[PDB]
Nucleic acid binder design. Structure first.
Ligand SMILES: [Cl-]
Ligand SMILES: [Cl-]
Ligand SMILES: [Mn+2]
Ligand SMILES: [Mn+2]
Ligand SMILES: [Mn+2]
Ligand SMILES: [Mn+2]
Ligand SMILES: [Mn+2]
Ligand SMILES: [Mn+2]
Ligand SMILES: [Mn+2]
Ligand SMILES: [Mn+2]
Lengths: 103, 78, 97, 95, 93, 105, 97, 83
DNA sequence: ATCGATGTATATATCTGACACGTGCCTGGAGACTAGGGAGTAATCCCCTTGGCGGTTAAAACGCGGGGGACAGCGCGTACGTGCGTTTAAGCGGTGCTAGAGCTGTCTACGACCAATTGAGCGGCCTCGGCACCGGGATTCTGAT
DNA sequence: ATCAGAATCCCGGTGCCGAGGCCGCTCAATTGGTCGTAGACAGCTCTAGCACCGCTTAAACGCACGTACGCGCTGTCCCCCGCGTTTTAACCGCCAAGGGGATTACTCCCTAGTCTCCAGGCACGTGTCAGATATATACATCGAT
């Protein structure tokens, strides 16, 4: 493969195909399917990280959409990135405005 | 039909919304709002179906529509 | 006995922000969807996932919207959301004119 | 019965790399796959304009790189460039 | 060196539409931007449509439906008619 | 006529719109009606706008369309204004609109 | 002597600045600012004088758009005076950070 | 030569002038600093991006185009300067 | 109510440089031809969608009653608009210097493209356990007192 | 606070269906290889970016004063929330039928690629009139008496 040759889990082949076929440019370098597959791999790790955490925190062995949402909205940097994305079955973070609380 | 969007349903959404107290006129306002929303999304959706020469609006037409409109949704074949 | 006006409200907020289940029952919604689309094209079929997709997108949107609505209510030293808030929210979003 | 692709299995392998004793639902799996494709477009897209902007025909690791720096928030970008520059050099090692 | 521009075509059309009327350097520039913006917006959304439909080629069917997503109503409708007209005109001649 | 523009009875250069669509990686291949169509739609809009700008220029007693004139044009037209709802025109300025509650009684 | 009442010159000035298009921030200050911020990102940068002018065009547009929406927030609160909290509500709602 | 405190170039009469074209009549005194705050987050965003283009184009000079591309990126498209 | 001065509106003449034009030089489009693969069309399939039906069962509805929040009125306290004199530095255009962009010119590395071989990845498969379901007992508040 | 008293949480038992795993086939990836061109890189020129100065003055600053608005208080009236019971249609489970979408094999129209041919479109130059700038004057209205 090449996932091997770059220590990646993410299909370095698949990616090189998709760049060429998805009409981004005439020609496509050798490093880029690797650079990108990596960045894709990197980021899917950070999510899987904090969601899993969240599934532990929420006492489950399996990650459901909520755990993703919690991971995402609680992370300041990830939340920005997915600033315009609604995640199916995410729900919302619990947040109740002060002045609404009892006295 | 539209009035099928029940007061209690609208109430729940506002609760998940963080809202404590709701005026009566809201409910109807919500409806126009929701209507406008679907219209635009379904207009774009259908346009995709019309262009795909299909009598069956898919999830991907929807998904493509939401993208177009900057309301991207995950979990239906991104 | 009787719970003081607004105290089940707070309790309900807690309950719904903790859950991720959809809040408009599917079939009225589904019927609303078909109606609106018929106005754009006749003799149409929907994938059940196509309807869910719409449903998720719409609710998520409305909730977000109430959030921002609710802030305007609060901005006006109020505690009740009113149509004039929604109009301001949307106006500033640049949704409405 | 059509052979529809995804990133599913690799998402999993990476899941094991980070949380060995944890699993995932189909519903969340879709979200991970959506997430991947969305991010792939956004980066690929930026890269694409980058090339054009600079009157050049090739999308190299460099184009991808700077694409990443426009697409990502300060910290997340930072690590991304790492893993990016790393796996590339490690790739150009082997042959 | 050669800096291409829609400066002539914009003049042409302005003269057709307001014959006793000139355009400033900045105004031209702006116009010139507007054409390019709407070009990409259209061209891009057409490109997505080809792709979404596993299709290797952007034909005016694409450019049309692209238009129906991008533009608001009266603008869209007229533009569509205007467009499919010049195609028809183009085939025959 | 030789010019594909003339074959289509258009002011816009259909040859240019053709080169661009290819040197632009939108797809492998481009149809031949797509440039035409697009070159025309470009024209409809530059026309549609120039029309309203000139009128704006006219009221301001002027021979020459300057960007205020484009701006006035754009934000006065419900529809054009939405097409360019996220766009800024150098030297545009804004529409004269003063809120009610700020007016003396 | 003579003294225009409070709010009288404001209304005048609004009308003045709503007729014209000329930039409102002074040219030189503006540039110094942009050169700073850019330095603190990468040293040893130069600018096309038109590139500054672009950023300013883009800057003022934004802020005027901003004040517009700020102003609405002041008015939402049965007020006529704009306040940081107003700006703050506009930006939350615009979904800025 | 070193550059310091330049945000205070954004004088109060100007932050005023903009607010007027903005339709604002009455301005609270705590506004002028918040505006500078905002203008800064704004310029830091466009220029972070403008610059990234300039670095990619392997240049020491930032062009009108790098700016315009940045704005387009941030969904604040600008006509009048190329593009 | 009448009166004056202030800013805006407008009229002029005036001076200047930008648009708009004509001329000529070149590069991108037109023209004509081929060869190849995309897409369109027609021919078969089966999967997904719709539909209709009837059972409990929760959810919608509706009303009742009273509490607290909206909203309107008022008044206090003060911050922000206005004006003027003082003070600071922007804008002007004018001169000088070289850094860096943009245009140029050669060589070759890296990518596309073709073909032939090989297992990575997908659908289809079954069993199994994480977790939805709940009925009981553990706690953590809410309102009344 | 101190009370009972809800409603909610956490817990142990049970149960079922989608996770996560393996079976094996196939098609996308990999390998080995040729060909040419995009772009690297070194050379060269020529724009415009920076710098620096001083004459001019429009803008900015700083302070004084008081006016009219921010907001804090009150006081009333009614519009929502809570809650019990009465009314609808959401939902689930079950089967039934054909529409349309999915897949396949075939031919031909259409588009990329290639070459040679020349005016559309560009820069370049240039001359004049639209519009900006300076200065006097009439018209409107705001606020002081
Ligand atoms: Cl590369
Ligand atoms: Cl075509
Ligand atoms: Mn610094
Ligand atoms: Mn009187
Ligand atoms: Mn040099
Ligand atoms: Mn190679
Ligand atoms: Mn107590
Ligand atoms: Mn338990
Ligand atoms: Mn080259
Ligand atoms: Mn059929």
């Amino acid at each position: 493969t090449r996932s091997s040759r770059a220590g990646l889990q993410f299909p370095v082949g698949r990616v090189h195909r998709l760049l060429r076929k998805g009409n981004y440019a005439e020609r496509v370098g050798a490093g880029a399917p690797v650079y990108l597959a990596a960045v894709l791999e990197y980021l899917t790790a950070e999510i899987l990280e904090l969601a899993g955490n969240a599934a532990r925190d929420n006492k489950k062995t399996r990650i459901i959409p909520r755990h993703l949402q919690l991971a995402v909205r609680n992370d300041e940097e990830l939340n920005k990135l997915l600033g315009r994305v609604t995640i199916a079955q995410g729900g919302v973070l619990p947040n109740i405005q002060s002045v609404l609380l009892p006295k | 039909n539209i009035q099928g969007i029940t007061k209690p349903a609208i109430r729940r959404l506002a609760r998940r919304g963080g809202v404590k107290r709701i005026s009566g006129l809201i409910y109807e306002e919500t409806r126009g709002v929701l209507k406008v929303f679907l219209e635009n999304v379904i207009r774009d959706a259908v346009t995709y179906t019309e262009h795909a020469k299909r009598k069956t609006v898919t999830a991907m037409d929807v998904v493509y529509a939401l993208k177009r409109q900057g309301r991207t949704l995950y979990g239906f074949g991104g | 006995h009787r719970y003081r006006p607004g105290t089940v409200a707070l309790r309900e907020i807690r309950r719904y922000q903790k859950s991720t289940e959809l809040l408009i029952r599917k079939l009225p919604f589904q019927r609303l969807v078909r109606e609106i689309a018929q106005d754009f094209k006749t003799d149409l079929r929907f994938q059940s996932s196509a309807v869910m997709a719409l449903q998720e997108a719409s609710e998520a949107y409305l909730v977000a919207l109430f959030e921002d609505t609710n802030l305007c209510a609060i901005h006006a030293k109020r505690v009740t959301i009113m149509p004039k808030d929604i109009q301001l929210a949307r106006r500033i979003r640049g949704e409405r004119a | 019965k059509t052979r529809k692709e995804s990133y599913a299995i690799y998402v999993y392998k990476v899941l094991k790399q980070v949380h060995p004793d944890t699993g995932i639902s189909s519903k969340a799996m879709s979200i991970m796959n959506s997430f991947v494709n969305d991010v792939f477009e956004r980066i690929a897209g930026e890269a694409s304009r980058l090339a054009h902007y600079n009157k050049r025909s090739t999308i190299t690791s460099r184009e991808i790189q700077t694409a990443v720096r426009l697409l990502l928030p300060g910290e997340l970008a930072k690590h991304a460039v790492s893993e990016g520059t790393k796996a590339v050099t490690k790739y150009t090692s082997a042959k």
